[PDB]
Amino acid sequence: GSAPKYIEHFSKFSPSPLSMKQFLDFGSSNACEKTSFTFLRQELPVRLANIMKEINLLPDRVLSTPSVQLVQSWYVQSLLDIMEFLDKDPEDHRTLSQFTDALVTIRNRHNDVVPTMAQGVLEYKDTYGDDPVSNQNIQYFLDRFYLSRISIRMLINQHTLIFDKHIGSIDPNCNVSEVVKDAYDMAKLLCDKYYMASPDLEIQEINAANSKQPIHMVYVPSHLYHMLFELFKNAMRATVESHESSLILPPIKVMVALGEEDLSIKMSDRGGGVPLRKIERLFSYMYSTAPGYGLPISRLYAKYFQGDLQLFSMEGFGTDAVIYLKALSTDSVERLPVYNKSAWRHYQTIQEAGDWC
Amino acid sequence: GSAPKYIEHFSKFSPSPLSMKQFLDFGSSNACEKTSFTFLRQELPVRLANIMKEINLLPDRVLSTPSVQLVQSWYVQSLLDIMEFLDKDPEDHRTLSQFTDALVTIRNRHNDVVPTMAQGVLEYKDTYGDDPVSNQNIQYFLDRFYLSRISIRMLINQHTLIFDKHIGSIDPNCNVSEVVKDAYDMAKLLCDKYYMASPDLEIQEINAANSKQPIHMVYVPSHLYHMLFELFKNAMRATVESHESSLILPPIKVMVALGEEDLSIKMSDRGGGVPLRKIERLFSYMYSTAPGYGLPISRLYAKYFQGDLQLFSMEGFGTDAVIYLKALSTDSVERLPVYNKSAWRHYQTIQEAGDWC
């Protein structure tokens, strides 16, 4: 009967965003998991508490819903699961071992948070409606909640993966074009299965400072894969469906550019395009629910390390999707939400008559 | 001694946004200026009052500054200038005539609002600093103020121009590619004068529903010209300066696309590009002041009729600038700010510790 107490305690702390450089450190090749354990033992509780504190501070219907209250109950379990180690000591080649077992266990317990939280969104639509203010509140909360989750899973993955070339999920020499090819291959496979047709791929890179040298960077390849796969699938479907009465289906072109501080990936298709007004809704969780969240969540993966994901099409022609990542491991630092008085007022919207007419 | 009274009176009203279709009407070929006079006699005072009411409701230093207080005094004059007709009657081929003379007079009086207001921005920077909250407040206010002005000048221009093929400043058959060529020509001229070199132009259009038919639309050609000229100048300078040690300067490519609801113009250059972080500042009045406002104001002209202006580059390669306009005269309606309790709280920012860490 002490969950509320903990949440109240650790929510007083602020999570500590780590640089991509720091991850490499705590990962190294030998760096003892002892440091990780002592660190994670405090940080994880801090991150859980912050997001839980924010959850408990939103409309009672959103709280009383089976989904939100359900995932909330999952986080309560996990919080406790970790407290168990606060008064434990390393040295015991066991204390550490049972920690990972605990982390791995916490991971599977949360494996369905996205689909579940997504279920609450549909319930909300049917229960209260799809007004702009509701959209805003849900959008604001879900971006933070999901980003919070990405980071917690990040920490957990680095630890479990390392402690038993690549530093866990991080590749200090990730070749961007290669991940682009992989994501394309999978998308093509699925495209051929469903449409029995698929556009080809053209890749071009621009290494501003070193003309012919292949482009490499320090990054999490699975994160980049997820973003690119989502984009290829949309670009393929649009290209295919928009040319079902034509025969020349055009190719998807990708450009990978490496500048002084940005590493940019642009994906250009000729899938017909989308009016400007519908672009805005493509990133909304609410407006993209029925009767998926690939795009809004993909954008969160870009933002996680100070990047971004943007779209701009030309209705009647095609669409350009661009992923902006930080070129230097130095500028690559976790983007983490924090529960403040600042965050509180984003939920005080009492909309009813705008400033424009 | 009754200026405050009027402002208080007309600020209780909401301006009335007009469609591009309505402009054509009140413009027609014979439509009597009588209707215009009776309409403008009320609307103009309503628009002036709204913006003036908003001005009087911001920090005393911004008010006490010579610039803001100075333009504010210009608006006070103009408000009075028009009141003079509230108790006047048409029929008198004179009452109307002296109205235009009054409008034309009001126009010249405001001819330097931009440079002047821009002067207050620099003064503010030196007087109070360039903090994010100040930026926000200035950005919010200036976008509305300048948009308000664009509309007032619009009404005034339609009236003065018509009453003495084209319906004033509006061209019901504006050929987009043609305006693109004009804007390019002027920019090239200036480019050659200063740099003694300039990239060429390539134009391509995509008429989705009618393959080879030239693209036309109902619009204000001078508005479109201004936006395109600003973009060409930036694209030329970047292309030139980024290739001063090379010889192959590449061309600026423009695509004009006409879809079911959007008419889009994309301008692509290979001027080297800009990091993502600096893009955000290109639209800020504050962050773009020294020791111009082409971009932020150009964006306002796009937004005026429900359009937009966006930028996205690839650092180390180039930049795409896109102007989104409504394809149909039906969806082309004035975008006007209004003084509400809604607008009031955008100036209540008391920033000090964000929701992200």
XYZ file of C-alpha atoms in Angstrom:
714
model
C 0.000 0.000 0.000
C 2.897 2.366 -0.684
C 2.792 2.969 -4.455
C 1.402 6.538 -4.146
C 4.222 7.343 -1.734
C 6.985 6.317 -4.150
C 5.471 8.119 -7.111
C 5.306 11.207 -4.899
C 8.951 10.737 -3.948
C 10.659 10.079 -7.272
C 8.419 12.518 -9.148
C 10.278 15.246 -7.242
C 13.350 14.391 -9.304
C 14.033 15.175 -12.948
C 15.092 12.443 -15.341
C 18.680 12.733 -16.561
C 18.994 12.855 -20.363
C 22.068 11.044 -21.654
C 24.199 11.881 -24.698
C 24.996 9.288 -27.345
C 28.567 9.678 -26.115
C 27.602 8.739 -22.577
C 25.784 5.618 -23.797
C 28.973 4.468 -25.494
C 30.786 4.952 -22.172
C 28.479 3.022 -19.842
C 28.477 0.459 -22.635
C 32.167 0.371 -23.530
C 33.425 -3.215 -23.733
C 34.176 -3.911 -20.066
C 32.506 -1.061 -18.125
C 31.083 -2.907 -15.113
C 27.324 -3.358 -14.927
C 27.739 -2.294 -11.320
C 27.663 1.376 -12.325
C 24.685 0.680 -14.585
C 22.809 -1.070 -11.768
C 23.377 1.734 -9.267
C 22.367 4.289 -11.911
C 19.349 2.465 -13.367
C 18.177 1.688 -9.835
C 17.424 5.397 -9.370
C 16.780 6.716 -12.907
C 14.107 4.162 -13.908
C 12.032 4.931 -10.797
C 12.415 8.653 -11.568
C 11.196 8.247 -15.140
C 8.240 6.026 -14.193
C 7.150 8.361 -11.409
C 7.234 11.445 -13.615
C 4.989 9.940 -16.293
C 2.697 8.320 -13.689
C 2.366 11.605 -11.846
C 1.305 13.228 -15.134
C -1.184 10.447 -15.873
C -2.912 10.769 -12.476
C -3.348 14.447 -13.349
C -5.808 14.278 -16.260
C -9.652 13.983 -16.520
C -11.230 11.188 -14.451
C -12.841 9.569 -17.483
C -9.471 9.133 -19.146
C -8.281 7.685 -15.839
C -11.357 5.511 -15.225
C -11.101 4.009 -18.719
C -10.013 0.348 -18.728
C -6.977 1.060 -20.929
C -5.299 4.012 -19.203
C -6.060 2.647 -15.742
C -4.858 -0.681 -17.099
C -1.457 0.504 -18.337
C -1.227 2.701 -15.241
C -1.503 -0.498 -13.215
C 1.325 -1.991 -15.282
C 3.588 0.923 -14.420
C 2.696 0.588 -10.740
C 3.826 -3.024 -10.841
C 7.092 -2.155 -12.572
C 7.831 0.702 -10.152
C 7.611 -1.755 -7.236
C 9.552 -4.399 -9.168
C 12.569 -2.078 -9.122
C 12.279 -0.596 -5.611
C 13.302 -4.092 -4.474
C 16.919 -3.270 -5.347
C 17.348 0.097 -3.601
C 18.635 -1.639 -0.461
C 20.624 -4.332 -2.257
C 24.372 -4.383 -2.830
C 26.487 -5.297 -5.860
C 29.486 -7.592 -5.450
C 26.902 -10.383 -5.241
C 27.111 -11.783 -8.774
C 23.468 -12.628 -8.081
C 22.002 -9.273 -7.041
C 22.905 -8.016 -10.512
C 21.695 -11.100 -12.357
C 18.200 -10.975 -10.839
C 18.084 -7.285 -11.815
C 18.275 -8.044 -15.541
C 15.757 -10.850 -15.068
C 13.598 -8.149 -13.518
C 14.222 -5.753 -16.417
C 13.515 -8.392 -19.041
C 10.350 -9.214 -17.121
C 9.324 -5.552 -17.031
C 9.848 -5.322 -20.788
C 7.444 -8.133 -21.719
C 4.888 -6.745 -19.310
C 4.847 -3.510 -21.346
C 5.137 -5.080 -24.825
C 1.563 -4.057 -25.663
C 1.335 -0.538 -24.276
C 0.997 1.004 -27.729
C -1.902 -1.109 -28.994
C -3.587 -0.760 -25.585
C -3.164 2.988 -25.231
C -4.315 3.167 -28.845
C -7.455 1.355 -27.719
C -8.245 4.040 -25.170
C -8.101 6.622 -27.938
C -10.846 4.873 -29.935
C -12.930 4.459 -26.762
C -12.536 8.163 -26.051
C -13.676 9.068 -29.569
C -16.861 7.012 -29.158
C -17.392 8.132 -25.562
C -16.720 11.895 -25.752
C -16.220 12.889 -29.384
C -13.450 14.285 -31.570
C -13.307 18.016 -30.718
C -10.095 20.066 -31.296
C -9.454 20.484 -27.558
C -9.708 16.751 -26.900
C -7.344 16.189 -29.842
C -4.825 18.639 -28.382
C -4.928 17.096 -24.890
C -4.539 13.577 -26.227
C -1.813 14.628 -28.676
C 0.134 16.443 -25.975
C -0.125 13.568 -23.482
C 0.520 10.686 -25.881
C 3.623 12.292 -27.422
C 5.135 12.639 -23.955
C 3.945 9.242 -22.743
C 5.286 7.426 -25.806
C 8.568 9.381 -25.802
C 8.953 8.575 -22.099
C 8.475 4.908 -22.998
C 10.964 4.940 -25.823
C 13.635 6.198 -23.404
C 12.840 3.707 -20.650
C 12.989 0.885 -23.196
C 16.279 2.368 -24.436
C 17.932 2.171 -21.017
C 16.547 -1.312 -20.419
C 17.726 -2.530 -23.822
C 21.249 -1.222 -23.428
C 21.609 -2.942 -20.050
C 20.062 -6.337 -20.836
C 21.785 -6.496 -24.228
C 25.294 -5.697 -22.983
C 25.471 -7.561 -19.671
C 25.481 -11.365 -19.927
C 31.577 -3.464 -32.832
C 28.062 -2.817 -31.524
C 27.439 -1.245 -28.130
C 24.078 -2.870 -27.514
C 21.466 -1.319 -29.800
C 23.919 1.402 -30.850
C 26.161 1.118 -33.925
C 29.110 3.537 -33.766
C 29.586 3.008 -37.510
C 26.052 2.791 -38.853
C 26.012 3.030 -42.650
C 22.798 4.909 -43.422
C 22.324 3.755 -47.026
C 22.455 0.150 -45.857
C 19.624 0.576 -43.385
C 17.721 2.358 -46.163
C 18.113 -0.689 -48.405
C 16.964 -3.082 -45.687
C 13.816 -1.056 -44.913
C 13.073 -0.823 -48.651
C 13.530 -4.588 -49.158
C 10.998 -5.472 -46.453
C 8.490 -2.916 -47.737
C 8.924 -4.154 -51.313
C 8.324 -7.712 -50.140
C 5.016 -6.766 -48.532
C 4.151 -4.545 -51.462
C 4.546 -7.370 -53.966
C 2.497 -9.763 -51.801
C -0.501 -7.443 -51.594
C -0.241 -5.467 -54.863
C 1.765 -7.820 -57.080
C 3.672 -4.708 -58.179
C 6.125 -2.307 -56.542
C 8.291 0.691 -57.498
C 12.071 0.436 -57.615
C 14.581 2.349 -55.477
C 17.241 4.903 -56.299
C 19.672 6.128 -53.656
C 22.021 9.082 -53.838
C 24.274 10.464 -51.140
C 25.925 13.856 -50.695
C 28.900 13.833 -48.349
C 29.450 17.592 -48.284
C 32.869 17.553 -46.584
C 34.185 14.301 -48.145
C 32.756 13.800 -51.652
C 33.060 10.049 -52.190
C 33.344 8.650 -48.677
C 30.309 6.562 -47.681
C 28.118 8.194 -45.058
C 28.375 6.726 -41.521
C 27.097 7.905 -38.154
C 26.653 6.848 -34.536
C 23.022 5.764 -34.124
C 20.481 3.069 -33.210
C 19.887 1.187 -36.478
C 16.582 -0.386 -35.375
C 15.215 3.098 -34.618
C 16.216 4.310 -38.102
C 14.795 1.129 -39.647
C 11.384 1.665 -38.049
C 11.140 5.232 -39.329
C 12.209 4.332 -42.876
C 9.970 1.252 -43.100
C 6.923 3.313 -42.165
C 7.788 5.904 -44.844
C 8.524 3.343 -47.596
C 5.187 1.573 -46.979
C 3.255 4.816 -47.347
C 5.256 5.880 -50.395
C 4.768 2.463 -52.056
C 1.027 2.249 -51.450
C 0.468 5.779 -52.768
C 2.594 5.189 -55.862
C 0.872 1.858 -56.589
C -2.724 2.923 -56.003
C -2.279 6.224 -57.873
C -1.047 4.408 -61.007
C -3.501 1.465 -61.178
C -4.737 2.791 -64.462
C -1.349 3.547 -65.834
C 1.622 1.279 -66.516
C 4.791 3.281 -65.865
C 5.013 3.129 -62.098
C 7.768 5.566 -61.046
C 10.539 4.893 -58.538
C 11.008 6.105 -54.977
C 14.121 8.277 -54.728
C 16.107 8.717 -51.538
C 18.840 11.193 -50.794
C 21.168 10.891 -47.847
C 23.001 14.125 -47.102
C 25.713 14.731 -44.519
C 26.331 18.367 -43.589
C 28.244 20.064 -40.737
C 25.606 19.279 -38.140
C 22.713 17.515 -39.892
C 22.458 14.076 -41.480
C 19.316 14.232 -43.631
C 17.359 11.539 -45.441
C 14.765 12.602 -47.961
C 12.333 10.115 -49.520
C 10.566 11.397 -52.661
C 7.691 9.563 -54.343
C 5.236 10.377 -57.116
C 2.280 8.776 -55.394
C -0.180 11.517 -56.266
C 0.263 13.704 -53.204
C -2.091 14.890 -50.464
C -3.805 18.274 -49.916
C -2.150 20.422 -47.241
C -5.122 20.174 -44.891
C -4.941 16.401 -44.665
C -1.189 16.446 -43.955
C -1.778 18.061 -40.570
C -4.101 15.212 -39.526
C -1.662 12.486 -40.530
C 0.271 13.160 -37.317
C -2.760 13.278 -35.016
C -3.470 10.168 -32.946
C -7.151 11.013 -32.734
C -7.749 11.974 -36.372
C -5.883 8.828 -37.461
C -8.014 6.381 -35.464
C -10.821 4.018 -36.492
C -13.157 2.277 -37.124
C -2.279 3.562 -37.497
C 0.195 5.612 -35.454
C 3.144 4.731 -37.696
C 3.776 8.363 -38.564
C 3.329 10.109 -35.200
C 5.334 7.451 -33.403
C 7.982 7.421 -36.130
C 8.324 11.186 -35.563
C 8.868 10.572 -31.850
C 11.765 8.236 -32.663
C 13.287 11.051 -34.719
C 12.780 13.613 -31.944
C 14.199 11.253 -29.275
C 17.795 12.203 -30.125
C 17.033 15.809 -31.133
C 15.933 14.969 -34.682
C 12.645 15.475 -36.523
C 10.453 13.902 -39.199
C 8.531 16.117 -41.625
C 6.237 15.776 -44.663
C 5.398 18.055 -47.551
C 3.614 17.043 -50.680
C 2.381 18.597 -53.867
C -1.198 17.512 -54.391
C -1.531 15.982 -57.833
C 2.142 14.984 -58.028
C 3.905 13.437 -55.038
C 5.346 13.679 -51.520
C 8.738 14.299 -49.890
C 9.332 12.832 -46.428
C 12.468 13.949 -44.621
C 14.165 12.540 -41.518
C 16.533 15.010 -39.783
C 19.144 13.433 -37.410
C 22.098 15.037 -35.586
C 25.315 14.292 -37.467
C 27.520 14.407 -34.345
C 27.379 12.029 -31.369
C 27.922 15.196 -29.329
C 24.562 16.791 -30.178
C 22.699 13.496 -29.890
C 21.085 13.739 -26.464
C 17.886 12.217 -25.105
C 14.776 14.381 -25.434
C 12.758 13.644 -22.252
C 9.487 14.995 -20.882
C 9.324 16.184 -17.253
C 6.360 16.780 -14.972
C 6.231 20.486 -14.039
C 3.808 23.327 -13.397
C 4.777 24.066 -17.000
C 3.333 20.775 -18.229
C 0.241 21.155 -16.037
C -1.163 24.172 -17.913
C -1.085 22.456 -21.319
C -4.136 20.597 -19.966
C -5.966 23.764 -18.916
C -7.296 24.453 -22.382
C -10.869 25.706 -22.046
C -11.322 26.415 -25.744
C -14.445 28.198 -26.932
C -13.938 30.974 -29.566
C -10.590 31.576 -31.286
C -8.331 34.592 -31.879
C -8.872 34.409 -35.645
C -12.202 34.742 -37.472
C -10.886 63.678 -27.154
C -13.020 60.707 -28.194
C -10.555 58.237 -29.750
C -10.627 55.825 -26.759
C -14.417 55.788 -26.980
C -14.494 54.687 -30.628
C -11.867 52.004 -30.181
C -13.963 50.707 -27.287
C -17.052 50.736 -29.494
C -15.864 49.102 -32.706
C -13.606 46.648 -30.873
C -16.834 45.003 -29.687
C -17.406 43.880 -33.269
C -15.623 41.144 -35.192
C -14.117 41.844 -38.591
C -15.886 40.115 -41.475
C -13.582 37.920 -43.583
C -14.448 37.983 -47.277
C -14.098 35.182 -49.834
C -12.271 35.696 -53.114
C -15.697 35.192 -54.670
C -17.174 38.064 -52.695
C -14.342 40.383 -53.763
C -15.172 39.665 -57.392
C -18.790 40.611 -56.638
C -18.280 43.963 -54.913
C -15.799 44.563 -57.716
C -17.770 43.290 -60.702
C -17.672 45.803 -63.558
C -20.500 48.143 -62.540
C -21.300 47.248 -58.901
C -21.889 50.687 -57.373
C -19.266 52.038 -54.993
C -22.232 52.993 -52.844
C -22.368 49.490 -51.360
C -18.593 49.556 -50.897
C -18.755 52.920 -49.113
C -21.494 51.835 -46.714
C -19.610 48.588 -46.041
C -16.083 50.009 -45.735
C -17.449 52.795 -43.539
C -18.106 50.202 -40.822
C -15.589 47.401 -41.513
C -12.437 49.575 -41.592
C -13.250 51.092 -38.184
C -13.877 47.564 -36.861
C -10.527 46.283 -38.101
C -8.563 49.289 -36.808
C -10.217 49.126 -33.398
C -9.521 45.424 -32.953
C -5.790 45.753 -33.628
C -5.548 48.996 -31.606
C -7.326 47.381 -28.686
C -4.755 44.562 -28.808
C -1.855 47.019 -28.997
C -2.999 48.970 -25.912
C -2.972 45.616 -24.114
C 0.751 44.786 -24.053
C 3.695 45.792 -21.763
C 4.073 49.538 -21.122
C 7.622 49.622 -22.465
C 6.474 48.299 -25.818
C 3.759 50.955 -25.681
C 6.019 53.775 -24.454
C 8.539 53.079 -27.227
C 8.643 55.795 -29.910
C 7.821 53.331 -32.706
C 4.788 51.452 -31.373
C 3.319 54.582 -29.801
C 4.170 56.285 -33.078
C 2.333 53.862 -35.370
C -0.425 53.666 -32.760
C -0.838 57.411 -33.229
C -1.086 56.860 -36.989
C -3.940 54.415 -36.515
C -5.706 56.855 -34.194
C -5.581 59.473 -36.926
C -6.918 57.077 -39.551
C -9.735 55.865 -37.279
C -10.961 59.466 -36.933
C -10.404 60.132 -40.639
C -13.101 57.558 -41.407
C -15.604 58.287 -38.613
C -16.263 61.495 -40.572
C -18.411 59.511 -43.014
C -20.679 57.599 -40.611
C -23.282 60.378 -40.778
C -22.839 61.145 -44.473
C -25.075 59.999 -47.311
C -24.311 58.634 -50.782
C -26.152 60.013 -53.805
C -23.821 63.002 -53.446
C -21.265 62.214 -56.154
C -18.972 64.128 -53.799
C -19.431 62.296 -50.494
C -18.031 59.216 -52.223
C -15.214 61.029 -54.002
C -13.809 62.558 -50.805
C -13.940 59.064 -49.269
C -11.394 57.655 -51.724
C -9.282 60.782 -51.281
C -9.442 59.918 -47.595
C -8.498 56.280 -48.236
C -5.617 57.199 -50.519
C -4.489 59.634 -47.839
C -4.692 56.944 -45.157
C -2.591 54.636 -47.325
C 0.385 56.994 -47.686
C 0.236 57.747 -43.988
C 0.870 54.043 -43.291
C 3.372 53.402 -46.116
C 6.206 52.966 -43.604
C 4.606 50.894 -40.864
C 6.798 47.884 -41.600
C 10.182 49.612 -41.429
C 8.995 51.538 -38.352
C 7.577 48.578 -36.462
C 10.770 46.781 -37.459
C 12.647 49.594 -35.732
C 10.858 48.951 -32.459
C 12.007 45.344 -32.611
C 15.689 46.352 -32.727
C 15.120 48.867 -29.911
C 13.493 46.139 -27.839
C 16.443 43.800 -28.408
C 18.889 46.441 -27.150
C 16.583 47.568 -24.342
C 15.353 44.247 -22.891
C 17.206 41.389 -24.573
C 16.399 38.440 -26.818
C 14.849 35.823 -24.491
C 12.497 33.092 -25.857
C 9.438 34.588 -24.136
C 10.054 38.035 -25.611
C 10.501 36.371 -29.016
C 7.174 34.561 -28.651
C 5.265 37.696 -27.600
C 6.718 39.757 -30.423
C 6.200 36.958 -32.958
C 2.591 36.459 -31.906
C 1.776 40.184 -31.975
C 3.612 41.102 -35.178
C 2.089 38.245 -37.203
C -1.383 39.450 -36.245
C -0.561 43.138 -36.627
C 0.981 42.671 -40.073
C -1.787 40.310 -41.236
C -4.354 42.844 -40.012
C -2.552 45.462 -42.104
C -2.410 43.347 -45.217
C -6.208 42.981 -45.094
C -6.912 46.659 -44.463
C -4.642 47.566 -47.377
C -6.470 44.925 -49.437
C -9.882 46.514 -48.888
C -8.489 49.992 -49.501
C -6.745 48.896 -52.698
C -9.793 47.212 -54.164
C -11.909 50.322 -53.577
C -9.495 53.030 -54.749
C -8.391 50.951 -57.741
C -11.880 50.135 -59.030
C -13.789 53.372 -58.430
C -12.728 56.328 -60.593
C -10.205 41.603 -67.145
C -8.767 42.600 -63.766
C -10.979 43.272 -60.760
C -8.648 45.714 -59.048
C -5.643 43.851 -57.650
C -7.303 40.502 -58.392
C -6.745 38.570 -61.636
C -9.494 35.992 -62.248
C -7.189 34.320 -64.781
C -3.754 34.614 -63.216
C -1.232 32.410 -65.022
C 1.102 31.228 -62.263
C 4.127 30.363 -64.418
C 4.099 33.886 -65.819
C 4.327 35.520 -62.416
C 7.110 33.043 -61.624
C 9.059 34.237 -64.665
C 8.604 37.899 -63.762
C 9.818 37.404 -60.173
C 12.795 35.402 -61.478
C 13.701 38.088 -64.048
C 13.872 40.841 -61.422
C 15.894 38.670 -59.042
C 18.283 37.674 -61.837
C 18.754 41.334 -62.720
C 19.776 42.198 -59.166
C 21.828 39.037 -58.916
C 23.897 39.911 -61.976
C 24.446 43.491 -60.755
C 25.867 42.419 -57.401
C 27.415 39.013 -58.212
C 28.048 39.276 -61.954
C 26.714 35.711 -62.147
C 23.326 34.049 -61.673
C 21.740 30.593 -62.027
C 19.223 29.847 -64.762
C 15.573 28.837 -64.327
C 13.655 25.695 -65.180
C 9.884 25.532 -64.796
C 7.660 22.478 -64.898
C 3.940 22.258 -64.284
C 1.682 19.346 -63.359
C -1.978 19.912 -64.159
C -3.293 16.758 -62.496
C -6.828 16.889 -63.935
C -5.938 18.395 -67.354
C -2.461 17.274 -68.470
C -1.430 19.968 -70.946
C -3.659 22.907 -70.068
C -1.704 25.850 -68.626
C -2.311 26.433 -64.934
C -4.520 29.448 -64.061
C -6.162 30.580 -60.838
C -8.031 33.468 -59.235
C -5.501 35.424 -57.160
C -3.695 38.701 -56.415
C -0.639 38.634 -58.703
C 1.312 41.278 -56.750
C 0.943 39.169 -53.590
C 2.294 36.094 -55.416
C 5.079 38.196 -56.950
C 6.276 39.412 -53.549
C 6.467 35.887 -52.150
C 8.310 34.482 -55.177
C 10.759 37.396 -55.426
C 11.786 36.935 -51.801
C 12.368 33.198 -52.388
C 14.301 33.645 -55.663
C 16.649 36.199 -54.046
C 17.489 33.820 -51.213
C 17.879 30.862 -53.565
C 20.143 32.874 -55.910
C 22.414 34.252 -53.199
C 22.861 30.810 -51.627
C 23.584 29.145 -54.965
C 26.066 31.874 -55.955
C 27.949 32.165 -52.672
C 28.115 28.381 -52.180
C 29.781 27.903 -55.591
C 32.313 30.783 -55.595
C 35.075 28.250 -55.756
C 33.437 26.107 -58.337
C 32.343 26.890 -61.890
C 29.207 24.861 -62.618
C 26.558 26.935 -60.904
C 23.342 24.863 -60.915
C 19.869 26.091 -61.840
C 16.863 26.889 -59.672
C 13.998 24.521 -60.480
C 10.356 25.391 -59.933
C 7.354 23.129 -60.068
C 3.810 24.393 -60.271
C 1.260 21.726 -59.398
C -2.523 21.968 -59.564
C -4.437 19.359 -57.566
C -8.097 19.044 -56.477
C -7.802 21.685 -53.782
C -4.178 22.870 -53.682
C -2.122 24.883 -56.158
C 1.492 24.353 -55.075
C 4.717 26.042 -56.127
C 7.982 24.448 -55.120
C 11.323 26.216 -55.614
C 14.372 23.919 -55.366
C 17.953 25.193 -55.279
C 21.348 23.635 -54.629
C 22.646 26.550 -52.607
C 24.314 24.435 -49.947
C 21.431 24.180 -47.501
C 20.965 25.226 -43.875
C 21.005 23.168 -40.643
C 17.540 22.453 -39.232
C 18.107 24.605 -36.155
C 18.717 27.752 -38.166
C 15.594 27.208 -40.296
C 13.354 27.833 -37.294
C 14.957 31.253 -36.710
C 14.559 32.362 -40.315
C 10.884 33.067 -39.597
C 11.441 34.909 -36.311
C 11.282 38.706 -36.419
C 13.526 38.998 -33.389
C 16.164 36.424 -34.354
C 16.325 37.964 -37.842
C 17.057 41.519 -36.681
C 20.276 43.555 -36.583
C 22.752 45.186 -36.266
C 15.057 41.381 -43.081
C 11.465 40.216 -42.598
C 11.106 39.047 -46.204
C 10.390 35.482 -45.144
C 8.033 35.955 -42.180
C 6.043 38.600 -44.012
C 6.022 36.551 -47.214
C 4.514 33.709 -45.150
C 1.783 36.055 -43.925
C 0.844 36.840 -47.533
C 0.492 33.099 -48.119
C -1.618 32.610 -44.984
C -3.852 35.614 -45.814
C -6.031 33.543 -48.163
C -5.667 30.252 -46.254
C -2.314 29.308 -47.793
C 1.113 28.692 -46.266
C 4.821 29.065 -47.012
C 7.278 26.426 -45.795
C 11.010 25.628 -46.004
C 13.003 22.436 -45.719
C 16.596 22.016 -46.674
C 19.236 19.348 -46.664
C 22.357 20.795 -45.108
C 25.264 20.288 -47.474
C 23.050 20.131 -50.572
C 20.167 22.564 -51.035
C 16.735 23.898 -50.059
C 13.111 23.462 -51.167
C 10.715 26.356 -50.559
C 7.035 25.670 -51.137
C 4.091 28.066 -51.426
C 0.681 26.421 -50.807
C -2.376 28.351 -52.175
C -6.054 27.320 -52.364
C -6.875 26.169 -55.891
C -10.548 27.215 -55.699
C -11.888 30.765 -55.334
C -14.385 29.146 -52.962
C -11.830 28.188 -50.295
C -9.939 31.461 -50.647
C -11.163 33.465 -47.666
C -9.470 36.179 -45.626
C -7.573 34.976 -42.557
C -8.119 37.742 -39.951
C -7.059 38.143 -36.329
C -9.662 39.143 -33.715
C -9.252 40.569 -30.230
C -10.661 38.080 -27.692
C -10.059 36.681 -24.222
C -8.494 33.936 -26.340
C -5.879 36.300 -27.754
C -5.268 37.884 -24.344
C -3.732 34.763 -22.766
C -1.096 34.330 -25.488
C 0.576 37.280 -23.729
C 0.412 35.693 -20.274
C 3.511 33.602 -20.804
C 5.501 33.604 -17.565
C 8.135 31.168 -18.792
C 10.708 29.821 -16.360
C 11.466 26.043 -16.584
C 10.127 23.850 -19.400
C 8.228 20.549 -19.619
C 11.180 18.823 -21.296
C 14.668 18.365 -19.826
